[PDB]
Write a protein that binds this ligand. Structure first.
Ligand SMILES: Nc1ncnc2c1ncn2[C@@H]1O[C@H](COP(=O)(O)OP(=O)(O)O)[C@@H](O)[C@H]1O
Ligand SMILES: Nc1ncnc2c1ncn2[C@@H]1O[C@H](COP(=O)(O)OP(=O)(O)O)[C@@H](O)[C@H]1O
Lengths: 396, 396
C-alpha cells in the first residue's frame, strides 16, 4: 500500500497574526458598523487559515437582517472582497462575521491526511475535504452520506475537490474492498487515473457507454440485494462479516443462488453533460440508484457546473441529502443546491460549504489543494502494485 | 396478546424545573422583547417535557405580527435554537411563546401506553403519538381520521414515529381484528416487521409489486362494498357488530362459505415519493381512488415522506386525506404545502411533530414518543412466538 508520505511537504506558514492587529481590525469593524445604522461590539476573535471569524454581539434592538442586508458595503469599506455573516451560532447569542485575510495560508492535503481522524477512520471510503474555519480537519464518511452533490461555477475549485475525494479513497482501501467507476464527459481531468487497479471500466468518455455503465450499476444493485436476501443479512458490512467468519471457521460458504464484495463508488465529473446528451433515462437511473443503494455499497459523487433547476432536478434532490457548494453565481443558485442562502459569499479556490447529512447549519470547509505531482505519484504507485482488472460486461 | 410490560421502563425524570428559574426566564423574556419595539408582561408559565409555553399578555395596541416577524431574533437573544409563537390561544387574551428547555426529556413509550385513555380505548386501531406540550398523552384513533400524511426532512424523527404508530397497532389488536399491509421502498426500517401474523403481503420492495398491492387494495375495497351492500349494513364496524350478534345467538350466516369478522386493513406506505418517482401517476390515481372510499371499508393509509414538495403532495392526495402529521420541515413553503398553513418550520426535530386534527383545528403540538430498535425486535419476536404467519397469494 502506498504510504501517505508520498505527498508534498508542509509549509513554513504565515502564522501568529498579532493580537494588536486583531484589536485594530476589531475596532475597525466596530467603527465601520457604527458608521451605518447598526451598533455592535466585538466579543471574541477566532483566527483561522483562510478567514477569521469575528463573533460580534449586536446591540439591544438591532436585528440580524440589519447586519445581513449590508454585507456588500461591510466588505467594501473594510477593503476586502466579500464578507460572510453567519446569522446564528449554535449555543451563544452572537452573530458571526467572517472576514478573509490578506495572505491566504493555503491548506495542504498531507496536513489533512496526517490527522488523528483520518488515520483512525474505520471505514473503507472516507473523504478528506480540508480544514474548517478554525483549522481542524473535517473527514466525514462517504458511506454515511450516502451520496454527494458538488456544484459551483467555473474556477471555484471543483475538479481539485473531486481529485481530493478520489485520493481520499485511494490512500486507504485495497481494490478488493473498494472499487471506482469514473464517468468523465469532459475528458480533461479524470483521464489521469487511466489504468489504476481500483477501476471496473475504462474511464468513460462517451455517453451511451456511460448509460451502459449506469444500467450495469442498477443490475449490480439488484443482484446484490438478491444475494443479501439469499444470505440473510441487511447491508454490505454484515455480509462481509459473514464471508469473513465463513473463511475463518474451517470451510467457506460457497456461491448461493463468494468473497468480500467491494464497495463500488461511481463518480461523475459533470452530470450536467449527461443530462444534456443522453436524456431523461440518465435522470431515472440516477434516481433509482440513489433511491436504494445505501445498503448495497454503491455511492455517487455527482459534480456539476450549473446549479440550476435544469441540471439539478427534484428527483436528484429527493434521494441525495449531502451537498457540497463552492462559490456559485448568486442566491438563486444557492437556493437551488443548498435549498438556502449563503453559498454566494465564498471566495473560490476550494472554499466550500459542507452541508452535513441530515438537517443543520452548513459547515464552512476550505478545500485542500492537490497537485498533478501528487496525483501522478499516487496513480503510478497504484499501477505498480496492481493491474487493470476490467470486467467489460459493464459497457456491453 | 403481548403484555404491556415488555417495553423498556420510564427513565428517572429530570424534574424540579424550579420556579426561580422560570421567573428569571420570564423577566429575561420581558427585557429581551422590551429591547425591540414591543412591550409585554409575562402572564403565566406552562412547563413541559421539551418546550415551555409562556402565556404573555401584550400591551395596548401592539399586534401579533410584530411578535412573529422577529422569532429568529428573539430566539437568538435567548441562547436557544428556535422559538415558536402561538399567534392565538383559544379562550384567552394571551399569546403563546414557547421556548425549548435546557435539558431535553426523552419521551418514554411505556409511559405513553400506561395512560388511562389507551387501556380504556374502544377502537381496534388506536395510535399513541406522545405527550403534548404539557405532559398530557395524546392518543388518537385512526379510524376517525381516516388517513394520515407524515412529512419532515431527513434526520427529523419520522421513522421512529412510524414505528410508534405500528407498535400502537401491535399492542392491542389480535390479527383477526386488525391487519397490516406494509410497503417500504427501502430496506431501512420496515424489514424488521417481517414475520408477524399481522402482515398480508411480505414487506414490499418492488414498486411494481407495490402498485399491484394497491390495486389489490382497490379490489378488496370494492368487494367489501359489494358484500356490505349485500348485507345491507353500511360501515365495516356495523358489519362486524351484525355478524357478532348473529354468531352470538347460535344463528350462522351465509355469504351471498360461512361469514367471519372482517379485519381493519391498514396499508402503510413508508416513503411514497420514491414510489411515484419509480412508477408514476398510476400510483397517485390509485391512492386517490383508495382514499376517496376507504373510510367505510376499513382500509386505512399511513402515508409518509421526507419531501413535502408540490410534485409529491399534490391536491389529489390532500383532497381525501385531512389528517396531517408535520415534523420539522425546512421553511414556510413546505409547511404551507402539507399543513396548508405556516408554523411547522419552528419545530426542534428529534421527533417533535404538529398533529393537525381532522377538520377545523389549530394544530396540536405533540412530542413523538421514542421507541428503540431493541423493543421492536422484542415485539416482533414476541409475535413470532405467539402466532403463525398467514399470507395471501392473490395480492402481488
Ligand atoms: N485549495 C486551493 N488552493 C489553491 N488553488 C486552488 C485550490 N482549489 C482549486 N484551486 C485552483 O482553482 C482552479 C480551478 O478549479 P477547477 O475545479 O479546475 O475549475 P472548474 O470547476 O471550472 O473545473 C484549479 O486549476 C486550481 O489550480
Ligand atoms: N421521540 C424521540 N426522542 C428523541 N430522539 C428521537 C425521537 N424520535 C427520533 N429521534 C431521533 O431521530 C432519529 C431517527 O430519525 P429518522 O426517523 O430515522 O429520520 P429519517 O427517517 O429521515 O432518517 C433517531 O436517531 C433518534 O435518535
Amino acid at each position: 500500500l502506498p504510504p501517505l508520505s508520498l505527498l508534498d511537504p508542509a509549509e513554513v506558514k504565515q502564522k501568529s497574526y498579532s493580537p494588536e492587529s486583531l484589536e485594530a481590525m476589531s475596532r475597525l469593524l466596530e467603527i465601520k458598523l457604527k458608521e451605518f445604522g447598526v451598533e455592535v461590539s466585538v466579543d471574541s476573535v477566532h483566527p483561522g487559515p483562510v478567514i477569521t471569524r469575528f463573533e460580534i454581539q449586536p446591540a439591544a434592538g438591532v436585528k440580524v437582517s440589519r447586519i445581513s442586508n449590508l454585507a456588500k458595503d461591510l466588505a467594501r469599506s473594510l477593503a476586502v472582497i466579500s464578507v460572510r455573516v453567519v446569522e446564528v451560532i449554535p449555543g451563544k447569542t452572537t452573530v458571526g462575521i467572517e472576514i478573509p485575510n490578506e495572505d491566504r495560508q493555503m491548506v495542504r492535503f498531507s496536513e489533512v491526511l496526517s490527522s488523528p481522524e483520518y488515520d483512525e477512520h474505520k471505514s473503507t471510503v472516507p473523504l478528506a475535504l480540508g480544514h474548517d474555519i478554525g483549522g481542524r480537519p473535517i473527514i466525514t464518511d462517504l458511506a454515511k452520506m450516502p451520496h454527494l452533490l458538488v456544484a459551483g461555477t467555473t474556477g471555484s475549485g471543483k475538479s481539485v475537490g473531486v481529485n481530493a475525494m478520489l485520493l481520499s479513497i485511494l490512500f486507504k482501501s485495497t481494490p478488493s474492498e473498494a472499487r471506482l467507476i469514473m464517468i468523465d464527459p469532459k475528458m480533461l481531468e479524470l483521464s489521469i487515473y487511466e489504468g489504476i487497479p481500483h477501476l471496473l471500466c475504462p474511464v468513460v468518455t462517451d455517453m451511451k457507454e456511460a448509460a451502459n455503465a449506469l444500467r450495469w450499476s442498477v443490475a449490480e444493485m439488484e443482484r446484490r440485494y438478491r444475494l443479501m436476501a439469499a444470505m440473510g443479512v441487511r447491508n454490505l458490512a454484515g455480509f462481509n462479516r459473514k464471508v469473513k467468519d465463513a473463511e475463518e471457521a474451517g470451510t467457506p460458504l460457497t456461491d448461493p443462488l463468494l468473497s468480500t464484495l467491494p464497495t463500488i463508488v461511481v463518480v461523475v465529473d459533470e452530470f450536467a453533460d449527461m443530462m444534456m446528451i443522453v436524456g431523461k433515462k440518465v435522470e431515472e437511473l440516477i434516481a433509482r440508484i440513489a433511491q436504494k443503494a445505501r445498503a448495497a455499497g454503491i455511492h455517487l459523487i455527482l459534480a456539476t457546473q450549473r446549479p440550476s433547476v435544469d441540471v439539478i432536478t427534484g428527483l436528484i434532490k429527493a434521494n441525495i441529502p449531502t451537498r457540497i457548494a463552492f462559490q456559485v453565481s448568486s442566491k438563486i443558485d444557492s437556493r437551488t443546491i443548498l435549498d438556502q442562502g449563503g453559498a454566494e459569499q465564498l471566495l473560490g479556490h476550494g472554499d466550500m460549504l459542507y452541508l452535513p447529512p441530515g438537517t443543520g447549519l452548513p459547515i464552512r470547509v476550505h478545500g485542500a489543494f492537490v497537485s498533478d505531482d501528487e496525483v501522478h505519484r499516487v496513480v503510478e504507485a497504484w499501477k505498480l502494485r496492481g493491474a487493470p482488472d476490467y470486467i467489460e460486461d459493464i459497457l456491453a
